[PDB]
Amino acid sequence: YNQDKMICRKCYARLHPRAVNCRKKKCGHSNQLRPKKKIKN
Amino acid sequence: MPSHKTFRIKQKLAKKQRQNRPIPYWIRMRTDNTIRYNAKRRHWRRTKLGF
Amino acid sequence: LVFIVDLKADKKKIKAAVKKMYDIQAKKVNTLIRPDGKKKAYVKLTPDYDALDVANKIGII
Amino acid sequence: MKRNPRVTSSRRKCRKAHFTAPSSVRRVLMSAALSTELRHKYNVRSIPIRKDDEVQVVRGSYKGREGKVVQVYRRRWVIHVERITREKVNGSTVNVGIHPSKVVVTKLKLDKDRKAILDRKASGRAADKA
Amino acid sequence: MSSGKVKAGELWNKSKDDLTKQLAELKTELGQLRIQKVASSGSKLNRIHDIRKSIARVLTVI
Amino acid sequence: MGKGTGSFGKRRNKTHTLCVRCGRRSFHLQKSTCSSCGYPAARIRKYNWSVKAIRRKTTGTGRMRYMRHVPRRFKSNFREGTEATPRKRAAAAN
RNA sequence: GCGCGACCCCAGGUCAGGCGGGACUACCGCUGAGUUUAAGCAUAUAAAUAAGCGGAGGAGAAGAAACUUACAAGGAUUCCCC
RNA sequence: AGACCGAUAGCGAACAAGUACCGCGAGGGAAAGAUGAAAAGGACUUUGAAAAGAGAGUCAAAGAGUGCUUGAAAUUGCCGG
RNA sequence: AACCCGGGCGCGAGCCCGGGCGGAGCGGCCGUCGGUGCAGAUCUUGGUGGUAGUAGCAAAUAUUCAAAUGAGAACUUUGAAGGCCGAAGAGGAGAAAGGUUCCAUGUGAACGGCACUUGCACAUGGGUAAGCCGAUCCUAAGGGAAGGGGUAACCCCG
RNA sequence: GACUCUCGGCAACGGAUAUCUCGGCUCUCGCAUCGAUGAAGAACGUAGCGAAAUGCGAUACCUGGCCCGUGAACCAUCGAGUCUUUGAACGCAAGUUGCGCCCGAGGCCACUCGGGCGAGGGCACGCCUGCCUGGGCGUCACGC
């Protein structure tokens, strides 16, 4: 799948394409996600 | 991902890992003959795993 | 309850096997190959018959 | 080398076969020479021993001692006799294994089936003698 | 009986019906020697060897 | 840039894995061939110009073989005779 | 100017019964090299080897004469000796 | 079975040997035996960073004390001329 | 017997004895066998000396003061002080690959190119839990299974 | 009055020498198959403590056929059984695993119509022999 996972800029914690938000510790709709740009070199 | 998954390599790797254990204090004692340096016992740093 | 099982297990046969031999309904079963070579199975049971007094007659820690 | 149509002579194989010995060959290693009274009742020069027998030490430092056989080991054919012990450095007392060749059987536990063999060997040895 | 068993000749002189109850009883008891492995007793040694044979004898004989 | 020192690190990727037929790391996975037994290949790889060590291995050596030999030594396939039961009995005569 | 049931050739299926495909160390049957030798080399030699391939048995394989022949006789066939 | 070899020899392999190990792989591939008649296989005590050491005990023998028969050479220390 | 040391004979190859050690096998004459004699071969294998207590353990300047614990502390652990890392000359999550290296407890012969109480060394135990993550199902260079036919055949096109 | 040369003593190191030999080498006799009724090759289990080894097989050093009468095994065991899984490997796939479909007696509930459990079996390697199935080829019977 071309979506890969979304990895949070604060915590750096990976949480889905279906989850709206991160939550690794209270990250808690911080919405500070960017997806895996979908594969390189 | 899994952490390369397939059961069929994964089990046999785990068997060699169980097989690489110390000899059991006893077999040194009843015993026939040997400085029982077991010997097919393999290491995380050195030489290299085979199948 | 936590059993070690055979390597040509599943979850349906164990959900049956446990049911026969210990008289309890089991709700889910979770299955692992182990570095043992053996299959480690966690068996979650009905609250109608609790793992504690299921266990006591074949005590386990 | 010398003679008979059979399996075996044979300095490589025989030294190997009897030192590590297979079973009836292990039963043969358990033979101790009879005492003279038994030697003329049961008509034989030697017999396999046993455990409710009684045995006199001829060879060793223990020589002259007599006692009941406690146990015998098949694997390394040796037997332990009661009171034939040496004391270990701690002082615990350990049996000293003895080869049967060293010992002579004074008394046997007769049995009935093993007795029947005794009854068989006596019949055999009458045909060499008379 | 209440004590463990068996001889080869005893199984042979039992019916198909008897020997399977005997096979039944044996797995159950074996199953006990598994929890009794946590105990680690020497009685569970001797017995876990000899029960293994009794199962093999019932399985062959049938 | 070049050879071995950098090229040993590049590497990560796999060709030779275990064969199912012989049990030896030699199966060339994306070229679907074993260079130790042939697999796929109908009959087992034997070459008789790979002489001494290799030939003996390919014969094999881990056999049961005793189990065949004992029949071969018997010849038959029958056994009756059940002697030694209280009377007793009929292995002695009279 | 014609359809139908039946005989007879081919084909597919089907379950049955029966055999075969891989193996054992060499022995045991086609294809088929070179180093080398000929102080070079090309016929020749190494060598119908090795090797590759296929397949058998406890042994194979070969066999009761359109044979030998150089006479005048022998009398299936291997092998040993020469 | 032997005018064979006898542990650098004989098989690569007397033992844990096609083992340990090398190579992506085809394939390659060692070194590896011996206390003692009997384990009697070193109690008890002192010491010590640890091992070990001291003293003593067993045996015909411990420079027979554990890859322990014998114990060359090449070499080291101490020491003697 | 072997070994070590010397004594005697023989030009001599070599023979012999005495002492110690060793602790079971060893000769001589004749007649034969032959894996039958080394200093060497960039000889092989093993061992061993000098080289030497020598080279290396040197460029991010990185620790310092107190203290814990310990038979033992420059390097284990606490605090303070001081820095260094910044698309990662040392942050987070992962693919392959490794293959149990993870956690805990107990050690310390070997390792760590040093110390070590420590450790990714040693030993023993323990941990990985999926209806909703991934495998899995699909199909892409192609590996192709399926005539016929070359090819003994392996094997190869379709 | 150093440190150093040569030889020796005492010891170590080292493992030659000598003997030993649970081994080969070689020669020779004997004997001689194992297979799709799963051999042979390998996997991983299998123990009280199990890493070796050989031995076995999801039944797991197997095993079938405590001392005065049925325990034990290269006693011989010219004796026979399990023989998981891969492996010719044969239902299909495959890095010694997995897979989805069909058929199923007999238990059950509805207890009328139906369902739903369950062992076990099956899912082109090739060829022959017996059975089905369809045209094609020359035709008889038959009405036109």
From TrEMBL, chain B:
Is Ribonucleoprotein given among the entry's keywords? yes
Transmembrane region(s): none
Biological processes annotated in GO: translation
SUPFAM superfamilies the UniProt entry points to: Ribosomal protein L39e
Record-level GO cellular component terms: cytosolic large ribosomal subunit
Which InterPro entries does this entry report, sorted A to Z? Ribosomal_eL39, Ribosomal_eL39_CS, Ribosomal_eL39_dom_sf
Note whether Zinc occurs among the keywords.
no
Listed Pfam families: Ribosomal_L39
A Gene Ontology molecular-function term?
Answer: structural constituent of ribosome
- What Gene3D superfamilies does the entry give? Ribosomal protein L39e
Alphabetically sorted, this entry's keywords are: Ribonucleoprotein, Ribosomal protein
Q: Which family does it belong to?
A: Belongs to the eukaryotic ribosomal protein eL39 family.
Q: PANTHER family under this entry?
A: 60S RIBOSOMAL PROTEIN L39, RIBOSOMAL PROTEIN L39E
Q: What is this protein called?
A: Ribosomal protein L39
Q: What organism does the record attribute this protein to?
A: Triticum aestivum
